[model samples]
Target chain A: LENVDAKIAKLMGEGYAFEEVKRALEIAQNNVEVARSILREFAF
Target chain B: MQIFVKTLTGKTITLEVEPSDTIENVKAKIQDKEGIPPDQQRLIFAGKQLEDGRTLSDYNIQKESTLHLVLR
Candidate 1:
């Protein structure tokens, strides 16, 4: 939960816009383990 | 400097500015260009109301920087 929160803040600071950032966070919050796994698949 | 205006009906227009004009003056000019009356005009930027009588330089608008307008 803390990591997800930090990532959300970082993305927002990068100007991703509110609604899109909210949607992304919702997806991450839905299943924490899956969110971390999926995020890991991307190279950043 | 350039000023961009969008009307309530979705029409977009742009104007070049003289160094001395303020944002409020720009709004009035925009109203004139769009054929809208003064009392009904509203100018917004980044979802906020710009202060009256401030120039583009005051608002950080640079040469060739685009200032967007939305009219209601």
Candidate 2:
């Protein structure tokens, strides 16, 4: 989470909305468990 | 089951969902995924708060239909 600057920027550049990028970074920063939960939620 | 969601900022988040997962769980997960703080997160489905313990089926959610999460 702390070191995700490049990945975050890359994702943002890839057309991932700014809000989504912010959200992903937030998830990565706050709670890995919750992040995994969302990953599970959105996995198709 | 997979649920698709949309945010007020025009972002889409798709997740695999389960029956036991409550609105609170979704909210927390959304907060985590979208970097939305609990205070700033507002989830409305069918013009409602999307309360905890309610199933996705309780709302108007449909297959491929996207739920909205507005951040303020």
- In model 1, which residue pairs have backbone atoms overlapping below 3 Å? none
lDDT accuracy of residue A26 in candidate 2: 79
lDDT by residue (A1-44, candidate 2, tens digit) is: 24343333334444444456557657767444454455446544
Among all candidates shown, the one with the greatest DockQ: 1
TM-score of each: 0.49, 0.51
- Model 1, which residues run further than 4 Å from truth? A1-44, B68-72
Could you tell me the interface RMSD of model 2? 12.1
Interface RMSD of each: 12.3, 12.1
Score candidate 2 by lDDT.
0.58
Q: Per-residue error at B65 for model 2, in Å?
A: 3.0
Interface RMSD of 1: 12.3
Worst 10 residues of 1 chain B by lDDT: B63-72
Overlapping backbone residue pairs in candidate 1 total 0
Poorest 10 consecutive residues by lDDT, candidate 2 chain B: B40-49
